[PDB]
Amino acid sequence: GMSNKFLGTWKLVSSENFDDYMKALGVGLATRKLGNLAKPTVIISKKGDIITIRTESTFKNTEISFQLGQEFEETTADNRKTKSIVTLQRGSLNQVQRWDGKETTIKRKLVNGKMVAECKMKGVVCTRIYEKV
Ligand SMILES: CCCCCCCCCCCCCCCC(=O)O
Ligand SMILES: [Cl-]
């Protein structure tokens, strides 16, 4: 399963191309403003086989709980209602969200102790890097 090194409290330290990723998702300017300003905290936890990813920011929280490989309903921070699946590939924790025949991927991997999230929509790529408290 998921490496235990994913578990903990993560703080965003850099973000590349999030505005165009949000545009790709159809997010409007006021909400993009909040997304570009936020320095969220991402807490990854696990109890038995249930993985939880909680995101906290000054103006918005989200939380998902899932089992690997089992599709679940998700309401994203930009209010998309998606069918999502999280899988594990070469130790990368890979989330796919599907809605209205669209899809986006959020792939989270550990690189030299940091968590690197690659977000892709319509081939637009954003990279968000986190360090662990
Ligand atoms: C984090 C909340 C900010 C406020 C609103 C943001 C709305 C855009 C959400 C786009 C999807 C977020 C992808 C985040 C990937 C990650 O965990 O780094
Ligand atoms: Cl914030």
Side-chain angles (χ1 to χ4, degrees), residues 74-100:
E74 177 170 15
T75 304
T76 66
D78 61 314
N79 200 50
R80 283 173 292 120
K81 312 290 182 303
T82 73
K83 297 186 182 305
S84 301
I85 311 172
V86 182
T87 54
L88 191 70
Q89 290 185 277
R90 284 86 59 170
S92 189
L93 184 73
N94 294 349
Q95 180 181 16
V96 62
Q97 298 170 335
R98 297 184 177 100
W99 73 110
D100 296 328

mmCIF file of all heavy atoms in Angstrom, residues 74-100:
data_model
loop_
_atom_site.group_PDB
_atom_site.id
_atom_site.type_symbol
_atom_site.label_atom_id
_atom_site.label_comp_id
_atom_site.label_asym_id
_atom_site.label_seq_id
_atom_site.Cartn_x
_atom_site.Cartn_y
_atom_site.Cartn_z
ATOM 1 N N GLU A 74 -17.034 12.807 -5.036
ATOM 2 C CA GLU A 74 -16.249 13.893 -4.495
ATOM 3 C C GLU A 74 -16.850 15.237 -4.926
ATOM 4 O O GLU A 74 -17.298 15.364 -6.058
ATOM 5 C CB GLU A 74 -14.806 13.777 -5.086
ATOM 6 C CG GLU A 74 -13.860 14.874 -4.697
ATOM 7 C CD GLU A 74 -12.420 14.610 -5.098
ATOM 8 O OE1 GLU A 74 -12.106 13.712 -5.922
ATOM 9 O OE2 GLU A 74 -11.530 15.364 -4.652
ATOM 10 N N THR A 75 -16.853 16.212 -4.018
ATOM 11 C CA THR A 75 -17.147 17.600 -4.359
ATOM 12 C C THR A 75 -15.872 18.399 -4.156
ATOM 13 O O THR A 75 -15.376 18.546 -3.056
ATOM 14 C CB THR A 75 -18.285 18.190 -3.525
ATOM 15 O OG1 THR A 75 -19.435 17.354 -3.682
ATOM 16 C CG2 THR A 75 -18.616 19.633 -3.943
ATOM 17 N N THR A 76 -15.328 18.902 -5.248
ATOM 18 C CA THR A 76 -14.026 19.525 -5.216
ATOM 19 C C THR A 76 -14.119 20.947 -4.679
ATOM 20 O O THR A 76 -15.220 21.490 -4.493
ATOM 21 C CB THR A 76 -13.426 19.537 -6.627
ATOM 22 O OG1 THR A 76 -14.213 20.384 -7.478
ATOM 23 C CG2 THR A 76 -13.400 18.122 -7.208
ATOM 24 N N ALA A 77 -12.956 21.567 -4.475
ATOM 25 C CA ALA A 77 -12.901 22.910 -3.891
ATOM 26 C C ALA A 77 -13.576 23.947 -4.785
ATOM 27 O O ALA A 77 -14.139 24.926 -4.281
ATOM 28 C CB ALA A 77 -11.474 23.317 -3.616
ATOM 29 N N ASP A 78 -13.496 23.722 -6.100
ATOM 30 C CA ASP A 78 -14.212 24.551 -7.074
ATOM 31 C C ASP A 78 -15.631 24.054 -7.414
ATOM 32 O O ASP A 78 -16.233 24.473 -8.410
ATOM 33 C CB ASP A 78 -13.372 24.693 -8.352
ATOM 34 C CG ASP A 78 -13.087 23.357 -9.034
ATOM 35 O OD1 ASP A 78 -12.701 22.389 -8.343
ATOM 36 O OD2 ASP A 78 -13.213 23.272 -10.275
ATOM 37 N N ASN A 79 -16.121 23.146 -6.572
ATOM 38 C CA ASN A 79 -17.494 22.658 -6.593
ATOM 39 C C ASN A 79 -17.897 21.764 -7.767
ATOM 40 O O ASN A 79 -19.079 21.639 -8.062
ATOM 41 C CB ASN A 79 -18.497 23.810 -6.435
ATOM 42 C CG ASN A 79 -19.867 23.336 -5.966
ATOM 43 O OD1 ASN A 79 -19.989 22.592 -4.988
ATOM 44 N ND2 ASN A 79 -20.908 23.788 -6.651
ATOM 45 N N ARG A 80 -16.929 21.078 -8.375
ATOM 46 C CA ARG A 80 -17.236 20.034 -9.332
ATOM 47 C C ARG A 80 -17.709 18.814 -8.565
ATOM 48 O O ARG A 80 -17.153 18.505 -7.528
ATOM 49 C CB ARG A 80 -16.014 19.678 -10.152
ATOM 50 C CG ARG A 80 -15.708 20.683 -11.231
ATOM 51 C CD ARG A 80 -14.370 20.395 -11.950
ATOM 52 N NE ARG A 80 -13.274 20.623 -11.022
ATOM 53 C CZ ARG A 80 -12.372 19.737 -10.613
ATOM 54 N NH1 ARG A 80 -12.275 18.509 -11.122
ATOM 55 N NH2 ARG A 80 -11.501 20.123 -9.693
ATOM 56 N N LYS A 81 -18.712 18.119 -9.087
ATOM 57 C CA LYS A 81 -19.178 16.866 -8.522
ATOM 58 C C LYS A 81 -18.650 15.751 -9.383
ATOM 59 O O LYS A 81 -19.102 15.552 -10.501
ATOM 60 C CB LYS A 81 -20.694 16.789 -8.474
ATOM 61 C CG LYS A 81 -21.415 17.995 -7.900
ATOM 62 C CD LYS A 81 -21.223 18.180 -6.425
ATOM 63 C CE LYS A 81 -22.028 19.382 -5.931
ATOM 64 N NZ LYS A 81 -21.670 20.647 -6.650
ATOM 65 N N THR A 82 -17.654 15.054 -8.868
ATOM 66 C CA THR A 82 -16.904 14.104 -9.651
ATOM 67 C C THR A 82 -17.009 12.699 -9.103
ATOM 68 O O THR A 82 -17.360 12.493 -7.941
ATOM 69 C CB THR A 82 -15.386 14.508 -9.749
ATOM 70 O OG1 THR A 82 -14.716 14.290 -8.509
ATOM 71 C CG2 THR A 82 -15.222 15.949 -10.135
ATOM 72 N N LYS A 83 -16.719 11.741 -9.972
ATOM 73 C CA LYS A 83 -16.464 10.367 -9.589
ATOM 74 C C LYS A 83 -14.957 10.162 -9.648
ATOM 75 O O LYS A 83 -14.335 10.351 -10.696
ATOM 76 C CB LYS A 83 -17.217 9.417 -10.513
ATOM 77 C CG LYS A 83 -18.735 9.574 -10.409
ATOM 78 C CD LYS A 83 -19.450 8.520 -11.219
ATOM 79 C CE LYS A 83 -20.954 8.705 -11.167
ATOM 80 N NZ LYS A 83 -21.467 8.740 -9.768
ATOM 81 N N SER A 84 -14.378 9.814 -8.506
ATOM 82 C CA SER A 84 -12.941 9.797 -8.332
ATOM 83 C C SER A 84 -12.443 8.433 -7.948
ATOM 84 O O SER A 84 -13.125 7.680 -7.304
ATOM 85 C CB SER A 84 -12.578 10.812 -7.278
ATOM 86 O OG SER A 84 -13.045 12.093 -7.705
ATOM 87 N N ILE A 85 -11.200 8.128 -8.325
ATOM 88 C CA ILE A 85 -10.522 6.892 -7.945
ATOM 89 C C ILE A 85 -9.066 7.218 -7.618
ATOM 90 O O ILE A 85 -8.437 7.967 -8.365
ATOM 91 C CB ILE A 85 -10.528 5.796 -9.022
ATOM 92 C CG1 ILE A 85 -11.910 5.564 -9.611
ATOM 93 C CG2 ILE A 85 -10.069 4.492 -8.428
ATOM 94 C CD1 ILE A 85 -11.887 4.622 -10.790
ATOM 95 N N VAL A 86 -8.562 6.709 -6.497
ATOM 96 C CA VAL A 86 -7.160 6.864 -6.137
ATOM 97 C C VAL A 86 -6.464 5.523 -6.242
ATOM 98 O O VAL A 86 -6.947 4.533 -5.709
ATOM 99 C CB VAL A 86 -6.973 7.488 -4.766
ATOM 100 C CG1 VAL A 86 -5.498 7.677 -4.460
ATOM 101 C CG2 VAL A 86 -7.732 8.809 -4.657
ATOM 102 N N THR A 87 -5.329 5.504 -6.948
ATOM 103 C CA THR A 87 -4.588 4.288 -7.170
ATOM 104 C C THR A 87 -3.131 4.531 -6.759
ATOM 105 O O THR A 87 -2.728 5.661 -6.500
ATOM 106 C CB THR A 87 -4.662 3.850 -8.650
ATOM 107 O OG1 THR A 87 -4.234 4.939 -9.457
ATOM 108 C CG2 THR A 87 -6.048 3.421 -9.068
ATOM 109 N N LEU A 88 -2.351 3.463 -6.757
ATOM 110 C CA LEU A 88 -0.940 3.515 -6.428
ATOM 111 C C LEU A 88 -0.158 2.883 -7.564
ATOM 112 O O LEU A 88 -0.394 1.743 -7.921
ATOM 113 C CB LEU A 88 -0.723 2.781 -5.128
ATOM 114 C CG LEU A 88 0.626 2.932 -4.456
ATOM 115 C CD1 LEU A 88 0.744 4.358 -3.930
ATOM 116 C CD2 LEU A 88 0.772 1.922 -3.330
ATOM 117 N N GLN A 89 0.781 3.663 -8.102
ATOM 118 C CA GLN A 89 1.602 3.270 -9.254
ATOM 119 C C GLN A 89 3.047 3.636 -8.968
ATOM 120 O O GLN A 89 3.386 4.823 -8.915
ATOM 121 C CB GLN A 89 1.168 4.000 -10.526
ATOM 122 C CG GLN A 89 -0.153 3.590 -11.076
ATOM 123 C CD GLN A 89 -0.410 4.276 -12.387
ATOM 124 O OE1 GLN A 89 -0.871 5.419 -12.413
ATOM 125 N NE2 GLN A 89 -0.095 3.595 -13.491
ATOM 126 N N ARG A 90 3.907 2.626 -8.823
ATOM 127 C CA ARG A 90 5.337 2.846 -8.520
ATOM 128 C C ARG A 90 5.488 3.814 -7.338
ATOM 129 O O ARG A 90 6.369 4.677 -7.337
ATOM 130 C CB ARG A 90 6.094 3.354 -9.754
ATOM 131 C CG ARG A 90 6.395 2.283 -10.780
ATOM 132 C CD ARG A 90 5.265 2.087 -11.745
ATOM 133 N NE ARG A 90 4.960 3.316 -12.475
ATOM 134 C CZ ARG A 90 4.145 3.394 -13.520
ATOM 135 N NH1 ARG A 90 3.543 2.312 -13.997
ATOM 136 N NH2 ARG A 90 3.947 4.572 -14.103
ATOM 137 N N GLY A 91 4.618 3.647 -6.341
ATOM 138 C CA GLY A 91 4.638 4.447 -5.142
ATOM 139 C C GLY A 91 4.035 5.836 -5.222
ATOM 140 O O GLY A 91 4.044 6.537 -4.210
ATOM 141 N N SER A 92 3.539 6.225 -6.405
ATOM 142 C CA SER A 92 2.842 7.482 -6.632
ATOM 143 C C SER A 92 1.352 7.283 -6.336
ATOM 144 O O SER A 92 0.750 6.326 -6.806
ATOM 145 C CB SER A 92 3.019 7.919 -8.091
ATOM 146 O OG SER A 92 2.532 9.221 -8.301
ATOM 147 N N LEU A 93 0.791 8.193 -5.546
ATOM 148 C CA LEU A 93 -0.602 8.134 -5.150
ATOM 149 C C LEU A 93 -1.381 8.985 -6.157
ATOM 150 O O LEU A 93 -1.250 10.203 -6.176
ATOM 151 C CB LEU A 93 -0.717 8.671 -3.733
ATOM 152 C CG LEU A 93 -2.101 8.605 -3.086
ATOM 153 C CD1 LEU A 93 -2.430 7.161 -2.716
ATOM 154 C CD2 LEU A 93 -2.155 9.528 -1.876
ATOM 155 N N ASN A 94 -2.146 8.319 -7.016
ATOM 156 C CA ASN A 94 -2.667 8.937 -8.231
ATOM 157 C C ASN A 94 -4.189 9.005 -8.207
ATOM 158 O O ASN A 94 -4.857 7.970 -8.157
ATOM 159 C CB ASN A 94 -2.193 8.161 -9.475
ATOM 160 C CG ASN A 94 -0.705 8.252 -9.672
ATOM 161 O OD1 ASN A 94 -0.031 9.046 -9.021
ATOM 162 N ND2 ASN A 94 -0.174 7.439 -10.586
ATOM 163 N N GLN A 95 -4.699 10.235 -8.213
ATOM 164 C CA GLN A 95 -6.124 10.511 -8.162
ATOM 165 C C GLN A 95 -6.629 10.920 -9.524
ATOM 166 O O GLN A 95 -6.065 11.808 -10.163
ATOM 167 C CB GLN A 95 -6.387 11.625 -7.144
ATOM 168 C CG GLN A 95 -7.837 12.036 -6.981
ATOM 169 C CD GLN A 95 -8.026 13.170 -5.970
ATOM 170 O OE1 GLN A 95 -7.091 13.858 -5.591
ATOM 171 N NE2 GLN A 95 -9.252 13.377 -5.564
ATOM 172 N N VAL A 96 -7.667 10.263 -10.010
ATOM 173 C CA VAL A 96 -8.370 10.705 -11.211
ATOM 174 C C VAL A 96 -9.774 11.136 -10.816
ATOM 175 O O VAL A 96 -10.387 10.494 -10.007
ATOM 176 C CB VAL A 96 -8.408 9.622 -12.312
ATOM 177 C CG1 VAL A 96 -9.153 8.378 -11.871
ATOM 178 C CG2 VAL A 96 -9.005 10.187 -13.629
ATOM 179 N N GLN A 97 -10.213 12.281 -11.330
ATOM 180 C CA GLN A 97 -11.563 12.826 -11.153
ATOM 181 C C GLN A 97 -12.246 12.879 -12.503
ATOM 182 O O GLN A 97 -11.674 13.405 -13.454
ATOM 183 C CB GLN A 97 -11.518 14.250 -10.617
ATOM 184 C CG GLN A 97 -10.886 14.371 -9.256
ATOM 185 C CD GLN A 97 -10.624 15.804 -8.814
ATOM 186 O OE1 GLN A 97 -10.476 16.732 -9.628
ATOM 187 N NE2 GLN A 97 -10.492 15.978 -7.529
ATOM 188 N N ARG A 98 -13.473 12.371 -12.578
ATOM 189 C CA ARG A 98 -14.241 12.328 -13.807
ATOM 190 C C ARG A 98 -15.603 12.986 -13.639
ATOM 191 O O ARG A 98 -16.302 12.741 -12.662
ATOM 192 C CB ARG A 98 -14.418 10.921 -14.340
ATOM 193 C CG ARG A 98 -13.094 10.260 -14.711
ATOM 194 C CD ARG A 98 -13.290 8.901 -15.318
ATOM 195 N NE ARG A 98 -12.027 8.299 -15.733
ATOM 196 C CZ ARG A 98 -11.357 7.379 -15.050
ATOM 197 N NH1 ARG A 98 -11.798 6.936 -13.879
ATOM 198 N NH2 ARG A 98 -10.227 6.907 -15.543
ATOM 199 N N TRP A 99 -15.977 13.852 -14.576
ATOM 200 C CA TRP A 99 -17.275 14.511 -14.538
ATOM 201 C C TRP A 99 -17.585 15.002 -15.936
ATOM 202 O O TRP A 99 -16.720 15.531 -16.610
ATOM 203 C CB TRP A 99 -17.275 15.675 -13.527
ATOM 204 C CG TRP A 99 -16.512 16.877 -13.970
ATOM 205 C CD1 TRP A 99 -17.043 18.067 -14.331
ATOM 206 C CD2 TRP A 99 -15.083 17.019 -14.110
ATOM 207 N NE1 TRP A 99 -16.061 18.937 -14.712
ATOM 208 C CE2 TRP A 99 -14.850 18.316 -14.607
ATOM 209 C CE3 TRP A 99 -13.991 16.180 -13.897
ATOM 210 C CZ2 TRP A 99 -13.579 18.800 -14.869
ATOM 211 C CZ3 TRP A 99 -12.716 16.664 -14.175
ATOM 212 C CH2 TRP A 99 -12.524 17.960 -14.681
ATOM 213 N N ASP A 100 -18.831 14.831 -16.373
ATOM 214 C CA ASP A 100 -19.297 15.377 -17.651
ATOM 215 C C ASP A 100 -18.416 15.025 -18.846
ATOM 216 O O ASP A 100 -18.264 15.798 -19.786
ATOM 217 C CB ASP A 100 -19.470 16.888 -17.528
ATOM 218 C CG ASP A 100 -20.548 17.263 -16.532
ATOM 219 O OD1 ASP A 100 -21.530 16.503 -16.396
ATOM 220 O OD2 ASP A 100 -20.419 18.328 -15.915
#
